[PDB]
Design an enzyme around this catalytic site. Sequence first.
Site, PDB file in Angstrom:
ATOM      1  N   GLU A   1       0.206  27.490  21.623  1.00  0.00           N
ATOM      2  CA  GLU A   1       0.369  28.377  22.766  1.00  0.00           C
ATOM      3  C   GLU A   1       1.728  28.046  23.382  1.00  0.00           C
ATOM      4  O   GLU A   1       1.918  26.963  23.931  1.00  0.00           O
ATOM      5  CB  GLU A   1      -0.763  28.158  23.769  1.00  0.00           C
TER       6      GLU A   1
ATOM      7  N   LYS B   1      -2.075  13.224  23.855  1.00  0.00           N
ATOM      8  CA  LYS B   1      -0.834  12.804  24.505  1.00  0.00           C
ATOM      9  C   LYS B   1      -0.465  13.774  25.629  1.00  0.00           C
ATOM     10  O   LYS B   1       0.120  14.831  25.382  1.00  0.00           O
ATOM     11  CB  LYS B   1       0.296  12.760  23.472  1.00  0.00           C
TER      12      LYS B   1
ATOM     13  N   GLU C   1      12.902  32.555  29.595  1.00  0.00           N
ATOM     14  CA  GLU C   1      11.878  31.968  30.455  1.00  0.00           C
ATOM     15  C   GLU C   1      12.496  30.945  31.406  1.00  0.00           C
ATOM     16  O   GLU C   1      13.116  29.967  30.980  1.00  0.00           O
ATOM     17  CB  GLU C   1      10.765  31.301  29.630  1.00  0.00           C
TER      18      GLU C   1
ATOM     19  N   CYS D   1       2.629  29.426  32.366  1.00  0.00           N
ATOM     20  CA  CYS D   1       3.064  30.211  31.224  1.00  0.00           C
ATOM     21  C   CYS D   1       2.729  31.674  31.386  1.00  0.00           C
ATOM     22  O   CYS D   1       3.370  32.529  30.787  1.00  0.00           O
ATOM     23  CB  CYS D   1       2.352  29.724  29.974  1.00  0.00           C
TER      24      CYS D   1
HETATM   25  N1  LIG Z   1       1.390  29.567  25.938  1.00  0.00           N
HETATM   26  C1  LIG Z   1       0.610  28.766  26.884  1.00  0.00           C
HETATM   27  O1  LIG Z   1      -0.616  28.955  26.982  1.00  0.00           O
HETATM   28  C2  LIG Z   1       1.310  27.729  27.779  1.00  0.00           C
HETATM   29  C3  LIG Z   1       0.599  27.073  28.800  1.00  0.00           C
HETATM   30  C4  LIG Z   1       1.296  26.166  29.599  1.00  0.00           C
HETATM   31  C5  LIG Z   1       2.646  25.923  29.384  1.00  0.00           C
HETATM   32  N2  LIG Z   1       3.300  26.577  28.406  1.00  0.00           N
HETATM   33  C6  LIG Z   1       4.687  26.308  28.214  1.00  0.00           C
HETATM   34  O2  LIG Z   1       5.034  24.956  28.382  1.00  0.00           O
HETATM   35  C7  LIG Z   1       6.447  24.917  28.761  1.00  0.00           C
HETATM   36  C8  LIG Z   1       6.583  24.022  29.841  1.00  0.00           C
HETATM   37  O3  LIG Z   1       6.019  22.783  29.608  1.00  0.00           O
HETATM   38  P1  LIG Z   1       6.876  21.636  28.916  1.00  0.00           P
HETATM   39  O4  LIG Z   1       8.262  21.598  29.545  1.00  0.00           O
HETATM   40  O5  LIG Z   1       6.156  20.338  29.155  1.00  0.00           O
HETATM   41  O6  LIG Z   1       7.089  21.915  27.366  1.00  0.00           O
HETATM   42  P2  LIG Z   1       7.599  20.806  26.306  1.00  0.00           P
HETATM   43  O7  LIG Z   1       7.711  21.440  24.912  1.00  0.00           O
HETATM   44  O8  LIG Z   1       8.933  20.225  26.680  1.00  0.00           O
HETATM   45  O9  LIG Z   1       6.536  19.640  26.325  1.00  0.00           O
HETATM   46  C9  LIG Z   1       5.227  19.788  25.964  1.00  0.00           C
HETATM   47  C10 LIG Z   1       4.596  18.559  25.419  1.00  0.00           C
HETATM   48  O10 LIG Z   1       5.120  18.315  24.145  1.00  0.00           O
HETATM   49  C11 LIG Z   1       5.672  17.037  24.117  1.00  0.00           C
HETATM   50  N3  LIG Z   1       6.818  17.045  23.250  1.00  0.00           N
HETATM   51  C12 LIG Z   1       8.077  17.403  23.551  1.00  0.00           C
HETATM   52  N4  LIG Z   1       8.848  17.286  22.451  1.00  0.00           N
HETATM   53  C13 LIG Z   1       8.064  16.866  21.428  1.00  0.00           C
HETATM   54  C14 LIG Z   1       8.268  16.572  20.073  1.00  0.00           C
HETATM   55  N5  LIG Z   1       9.573  16.695  19.472  1.00  0.00           N
HETATM   56  N6  LIG Z   1       7.237  16.164  19.316  1.00  0.00           N
HETATM   57  C15 LIG Z   1       6.016  16.030  19.856  1.00  0.00           C
HETATM   58  N7  LIG Z   1       5.780  16.301  21.138  1.00  0.00           N
HETATM   59  C16 LIG Z   1       6.776  16.713  21.943  1.00  0.00           C
HETATM   60  C17 LIG Z   1       5.978  16.726  25.537  1.00  0.00           C
HETATM   61  O11 LIG Z   1       5.960  15.356  25.730  1.00  0.00           O
HETATM   62  C18 LIG Z   1       4.919  17.358  26.231  1.00  0.00           C
HETATM   63  O12 LIG Z   1       3.790  16.536  26.277  1.00  0.00           O
HETATM   64  C19 LIG Z   1       6.819  26.318  29.094  1.00  0.00           C
HETATM   65  O13 LIG Z   1       7.508  26.866  28.047  1.00  0.00           O
HETATM   66  C20 LIG Z   1       5.522  26.994  29.237  1.00  0.00           C
HETATM   67  O14 LIG Z   1       5.583  28.327  28.976  1.00  0.00           O
HETATM   68  C21 LIG Z   1       2.677  27.463  27.601  1.00  0.00           C
END
Ligand SMILES: NC(=O)c1ccc[n+]([C@@H]2O[C@H](COP(=O)([O-])OP(=O)(O)OC[C@H]3O[C@@H](n4cnc5c(N)ncnc54)[C@H](O)[C@@H]3O)[C@@H](O)[C@H]2O)c1
Lengths: 484, 482, 483, 483
Positions: free
Chosen positions: B250, B174, B386, B284
């Site tokens: 992550e 997804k 962040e 990230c």
């Molecule tokens: N630690 C790493 O390696 C890494 C790498 C890239 C991004 N990030 C992090 O990602 C964040 C930014 O991306 P984001 O805004 O898309 O994060 P997000 O948590 O809002 O979304 C991530 C994914 O999870 C899904 N999602 C959201 N809520 C969900 C739920 N309740 N159940 C199942 N799936 C759900 C979203 O649709 C999306 O596909 C930042 O915090 C960034 O640091 C971390």
Amino acid sequence: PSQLLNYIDGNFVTSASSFANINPVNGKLISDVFEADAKQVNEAVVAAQNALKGPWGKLSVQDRAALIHKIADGIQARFEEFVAAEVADTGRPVHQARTLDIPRAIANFRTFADLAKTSHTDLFEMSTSDGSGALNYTVRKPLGVIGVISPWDLPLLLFTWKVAPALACGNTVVAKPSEESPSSATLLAEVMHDAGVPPGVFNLIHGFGKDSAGEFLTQHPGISALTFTGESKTGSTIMKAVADGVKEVSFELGGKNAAVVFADADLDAAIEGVLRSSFTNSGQVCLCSERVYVHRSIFDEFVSGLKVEAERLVVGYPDQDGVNMGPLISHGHRDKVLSYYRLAVDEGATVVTGGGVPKFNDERDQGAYVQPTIWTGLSDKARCVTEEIFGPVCHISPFDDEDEVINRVNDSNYGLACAIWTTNLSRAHRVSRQIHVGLVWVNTWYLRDLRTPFGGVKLSGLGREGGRFSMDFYSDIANICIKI
Amino acid sequence: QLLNYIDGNFVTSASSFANINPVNGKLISDVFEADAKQVNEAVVAAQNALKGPWGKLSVQDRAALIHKIADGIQARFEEFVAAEVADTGRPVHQARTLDIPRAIANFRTFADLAKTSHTDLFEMSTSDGSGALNYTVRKPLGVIGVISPWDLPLLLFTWKVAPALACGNTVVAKPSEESPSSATLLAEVMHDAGVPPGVFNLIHGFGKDSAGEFLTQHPGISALTFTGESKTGSTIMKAVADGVKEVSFELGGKNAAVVFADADLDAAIEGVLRSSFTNSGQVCLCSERVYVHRSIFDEFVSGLKVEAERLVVGYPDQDGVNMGPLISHGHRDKVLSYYRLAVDEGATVVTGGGVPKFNDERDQGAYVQPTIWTGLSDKARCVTEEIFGPVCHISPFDDEDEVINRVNDSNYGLACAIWTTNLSRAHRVSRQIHVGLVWVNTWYLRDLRTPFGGVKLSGLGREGGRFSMDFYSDIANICIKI
Amino acid sequence: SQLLNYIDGNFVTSASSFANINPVNGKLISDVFEADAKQVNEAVVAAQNALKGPWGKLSVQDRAALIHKIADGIQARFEEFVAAEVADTGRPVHQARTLDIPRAIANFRTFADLAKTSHTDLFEMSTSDGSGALNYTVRKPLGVIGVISPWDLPLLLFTWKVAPALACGNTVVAKPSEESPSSATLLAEVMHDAGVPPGVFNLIHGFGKDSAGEFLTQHPGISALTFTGESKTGSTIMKAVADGVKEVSFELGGKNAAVVFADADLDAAIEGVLRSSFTNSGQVCLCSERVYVHRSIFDEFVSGLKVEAERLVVGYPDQDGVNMGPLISHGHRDKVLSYYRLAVDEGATVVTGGGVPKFNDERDQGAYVQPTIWTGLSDKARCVTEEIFGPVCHISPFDDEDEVINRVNDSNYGLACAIWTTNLSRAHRVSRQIHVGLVWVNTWYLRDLRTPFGGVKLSGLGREGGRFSMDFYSDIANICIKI
Amino acid sequence: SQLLNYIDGNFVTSASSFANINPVNGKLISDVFEADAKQVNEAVVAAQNALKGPWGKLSVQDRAALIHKIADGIQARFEEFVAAEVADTGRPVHQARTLDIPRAIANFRTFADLAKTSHTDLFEMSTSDGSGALNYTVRKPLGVIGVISPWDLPLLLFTWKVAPALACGNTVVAKPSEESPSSATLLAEVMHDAGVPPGVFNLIHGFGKDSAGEFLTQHPGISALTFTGESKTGSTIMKAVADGVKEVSFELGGKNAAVVFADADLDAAIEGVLRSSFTNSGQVCLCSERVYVHRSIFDEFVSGLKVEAERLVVGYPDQDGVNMGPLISHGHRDKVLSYYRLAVDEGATVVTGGGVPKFNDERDQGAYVQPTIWTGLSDKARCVTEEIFGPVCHISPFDDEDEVINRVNDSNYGLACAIWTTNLSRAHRVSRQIHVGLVWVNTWYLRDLRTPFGGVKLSGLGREGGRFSMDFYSDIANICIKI
Ligand SMILES: NC(=O)c1ccc[n+]([C@@H]2O[C@H](COP(=O)([O-])OP(=O)(O)OC[C@H]3O[C@@H](n4cnc5c(N)ncnc54)[C@H](O)[C@@H]3O)[C@@H](O)[C@H]2O)c1
Ligand SMILES: NC(=O)c1ccc[n+]([C@@H]2O[C@H](COP(=O)([O-])OP(=O)(O)OC[C@H]3O[C@@H](n4cnc5c(N)ncnc54)[C@H](O)[C@@H]3O)[C@@H](O)[C@H]2O)c1
Ligand code: NA
Ligand code: NA
Ligand code: NA
Ligand code: NA
């Protein structure tokens, strides 16, 4: 009679309330155990965090390993006291405590001390655009404070199974043994103290789970990880409890393990093996076989043979001559087991042997004994064939075909262990690799190499421990990249 | 239009939602959102696929098929570049050099690891003198649930998908609602490469009350590997707990860069510019905190200011461009609210602090300016939370032990970049930083074999190299009594 | 029709030439230019120089990419390599298509992959001053590898050494068997066309003693000598590199046993021993020339094997249904026949074969012998102890497990052994007691290229394959940083 | 005092005996019985047989516990062992107490632990019929290990080979240097008292050619020869075992360099180079006899080293603040002084030392020389290129990094190198380019027993330490099960 104290920041301390430790052999009070409260639990965690910055954190890997060997020496020097402690709490046969439980706890410390001494990490070279290159190397650091919660089936063995690698990897520990079996852990704390383990490195808290020390530990933000062995439902609860802090977790949970006896098995050896896998520690081991599948051609003979051997089992005192089986851990646990004995009859079982409680006509009638029990006749869908009973019982069912039996073994929400009996070379390897469990034994059961990965699949676990798997789980693995 | 890919077929849904170009706020495509029924269908098809032709491939053949997936991407390279750019507004050069080649490397590297990986053999003695053998085997875990974010959409998507397939698993994946296009092209490559139906399933949608949630709740999966926000991680961890599913997380970071007095100063300014503003600060791994030794502080900030101001904000293909917009308007809102919050907290705005004026369609986009703050306390919200924008706060330090303590004083611990030319200092300081990844005199340099992950709120587990081969596999132990 | 050396990026001729002879019919197939000491020196120097060139600068990824290109280049000319192997050796075309050529290609791909994925070690340690230190290891090219290969599996064994040598970033001076120079020469062409820098891969032709082979082993410019061939030759070579303390890796002779227990799948064992005894006309180092069969199935085993052996089609490599071609050379056949003769003198019963077939055509001018089975010899007989290297096996009965293990191990060789049994404990219990480098259970010559490969006693020195090749063909250096 | 051989569980004397001579004062320490060919044969047969006795039946765990008991036995006699090492060699008592004896104990403990934790490999593979196959490897004892050791670090190097041999389940015939036979003999007592089964460990005394050492390398009963000593001797032994194709592991000579870059911690470098040139009176294979210093700090470096070298105390092993004992023997001193003259003849400036100290006591009958520093010789001078094995170093300036790398590598040896720099990039960039087995940055002789140890070029063959010892001292066997 006895009192079992907590051990927090280098001192044995009492608590505001205490609870009863009951000998399941005769229902008598063994000791009072002081239950750690939330304040005491917090103090233990805080002590563990601070100890990471003390003498302990300054020790070389070699000095740490030497000290851990000293812990093992101290258990060895008090071997019979530890035997007596495990026995008093659980009613296990003395011979089992002398040959399995206490030696393995000693071996847990030695082996992880050794693994710590000999383990290393990785070096990766790479090229870069400027043609100058780079180095990535990995280091193992202590994860931090490890929360340990352990069960009552193999109390010191499972307790040290977690504490040994935690300490070997330079972590500090707060550990809560099962309320049913707190004695050997308390003795262990004395060994730690006498060995000179610095204050705060190892902390022992006694109590229950919910609304008690167990829960307080899992909820504390100061731990870096929670390793746990117990019921599947409890694992789920704990996983939810630590989710907000994204704590590292390691779970070894329930099972409904199968033994499979093929037509080409050594039949006498298989009967004895299954007897052992079903009734050891009175069926109170996560690894025990509660489902047995036997080829149609040998089914009747296997069942007759096992019945006789089961009925030869001596159920009695821990130090009684030729004793094979003690009682269940507690009256509460016996009530669960007997309601399954009842459920099996209701579900249509034939009771080949047992099915009730032995009548001793002495003080043991006040204890928590049940009979070793064999069933036949239940469908694969019966509750008694699908749910973990954790008593001295097995249902036995025939099969005809190898793929059929493999499929029936795998048809479970659990996936811990399986024992397979066959003299055929191809069949041993072909069949074993298709069993969806963490551990398969061929022509034996519960043979342990402490270097191997150990764990379950599905509802039986998350993660692996043992050998390098413990060295990874109880460590922070960090990557350091240097541009040259 | 972007469709789901389920059991070998492209399928539509009862609901669709908009895929908006962030450069100009224009509609790129309608995206069909998988409902719970379709998520179940993807999962069931994943389970069955394990028992079909896919599950009978030798490791070598599997690896060959995976190399074919990589060739498929390479053969449609520019098409993948265009999809990533469209969804996100990232510079064309970034997509061409980082995003798309890494996705190809992901598949190839894990194909190679799968081909050369082996397991262990333990000999032991027994009472009867005959002995026993214990050996381990790696099996597919089963169905892997993959949920991925928008910062590096294809890279992160394939960072999970490649090892999952290399280890013989099947996948229900997804991608982020903000960046569904390149994952949809991938499903096309998969199909055209003859990956059996059910092996790779792409489901589109959101989180709560959507495909994401539905996936994490499905009892048919064997693991959930997730990359995103920390709080989302906590949520998913709760969701899969009842099935005790394997998890790999992550999560967020508030990463620090540290410039010691003995650093090569020009390389350090250049490095921190890169670590702060790459992909418009939406990685990230970005440094949003920077510590510079007092003796070089003013010189550093001046130098960074100049470089920061030379950065070109514009069209993805606009020659010399350095930054495109943020992923979305909603995300710009969050970032701008932090821009205000910094001033309200007493920050000096060394540069940027708002949004550039274009006078064309780009004003309908979601741009902001690269921003630098000084003058905040270590406890300020803008220094601890962040932001995920093109921003950094810079603070002076005096002592080595001081700055180590200040770097580690965080609920996060993903990565850290350190600049120094001193040998002892490099290794002494590196080992003390409480994070998953430390770079010295560089940033975001990556060897795919290395363990990758974060500590504390920044993650759970490690992926990369053997850690992915371990996570995406059942490790089973077989013991033969001789 | 002419086979040239390949030195420093150039195909070059030599002063002397020798005849490459088709063992199917004894006809000359090509003239091969023999490298003299001067050309050998030129080859080593060129290999030394290439280390300092573009080849030395390639990243491991790039190097691996190029090695895959070499593999691709063999694949694109697949049928020519087949023709080359067949022409020189008389091996069945089917064998060349399924065994010889694909393995040469797999050799290059596998070691390229290993090079790409291999890493080394980090050790942390504490120090008196409490600051600690770091130890890390790296793999560096060893230098110039001298490769010397035999004629039984010409391209397979040649690439078995050249692939890891190049994968680890070495440069190579390689000397194929005088009996089988063709496929190695086509390989040079593929290297050239792939753009492998000059001097990286060098091919010298010649004999052993007093020729290209000798000269390479005595050149001080090489860093290592990897060799596959006769045990006595291994000894000779070991002395020759001694003054230089060159790294060495030897895969030498054997007198390999097969053991069939009473609980074996008898039909599978018969087919198995048939493969293990007569594949490549018994001309493989891994072949079984001694066979032990439990008493209770002895007569039935021997009768079954006789029938299968007599069904073997001996003939032309492209003859429909051919199972065996000729021996490598007339000189090799003379040795094999001297052993057939000796067996009879030693009191052997000849179960089948024992001579040369009569074809009444050009094949009679070639180097054929019959697949041969003996019984009735003692364990101390020369035909039971010395490697013959022809399509032959002696079969002896046995009674006890410990007995047969002792008789297998009672040898100065220790390369490989095949055991046939359906019993789980026995398989594992017996296998571990056989003093050889390689045991197969219920099969023969199944190869996983990641596994250690080699022999004990006179059959070898060192191990190759997987991590073992990555180590042998690399300089392993420890770097220790005080912090 | 008397030192006997230890064979088949018994201390035995011999027809021939020779003298053990204290280098401090030339006095007789003991008589040592020289084992003849008959006795060497007796040792090897005993060792072979012991493989089939109780030793061969121990679990890895029990074998490891026994080895820890051996280490216990040395610890329990710690001071006696210190006394013995010191008496034979004149080494400072402090060095024997902190380096020599503790490392010997650590050797046994480390390899015992490695044995307990080590495992091997499992490779799965697909097959035509789709049933698959398993390849697994096992480590078995190699057999009888012949061990031959030098006198620079007697018990440390002796046990460096003996410990892994025993930990891998082998049996041992071990021949310590004629110059340093004491501690090895005490080791035999420890083994006996710890109850090591007869034949498992055998001690033979004597010399090389026409003596025990030669006889050992010629005996067809050994399975391997691990050796540490002179390069020429390694070549001789390699020829000696070639007919048996015996496994070999050599740690040979060196002419090691130290490099001081301009950004080095100068005082630490001066102190570091002093250690690396004069420790054990320069009688360590790892010592630096060549030193390169950047031009900008050259004069400052040489002055500082001169002063620090002149503060060194040369005297009795237990003397207050002693830094250097004598050389091992008058014969060795003769060789060293011969080099002292040669350097003058080659046109060296003698910065310090260059002769023998004058004691006016019994030390004058000993084998002492002065720590010596030279400058002004060219890279090609004999004194800059040949191993002297005394307390000496030549110092030369350099200007460029690539230049000094080339100059360090311009040698037929390649054992070790110490480098001094405070620069992060330079430490890692330069280290990887040095063609030796071991590099130290900002230290010298820092050892982690898990690391690979060995040299390149004339400095050795193969590696030991950690997994590399576990591999060398074992038979690695592959077992392939068709499923
Ligand atoms: N630690 C790493 O390696 C890494 C790498 C890239 C991004 N990030 C992090 O990602 C964040 C930014 O991306 P984001 O805004 O898309 O994060 P997000 O948590 O809002 O979304 C991530 C994914 O999870 C899904 N999602 C959201 N809520 C969900 C739920 N309740 N159940 C199942 N799936 C759900 C979203 O649709 C999306 O596909 C930042 O915090 C960034 O640091 C971390
Ligand atoms: N153990 C293995 O893996 C393996 C594999 C294949 C063949 N072999 C052995 O090879 C033998 C058959 O091949 P062969 O007849 O070509 O053996 P051979 O040893 O006589 O010749 C092998 C190679 O070495 C060269 N050579 C011969 N004398 C030399 C010398 N003095 N110095 C340097 N090089 C010299 C030859 O020219 C040839 O290239 C058999 O004994 C067989 O068992 C062993
Ligand atoms: Na109790
Ligand atoms: Na969008
Ligand atoms: Na020929
Ligand atoms: Na002496």
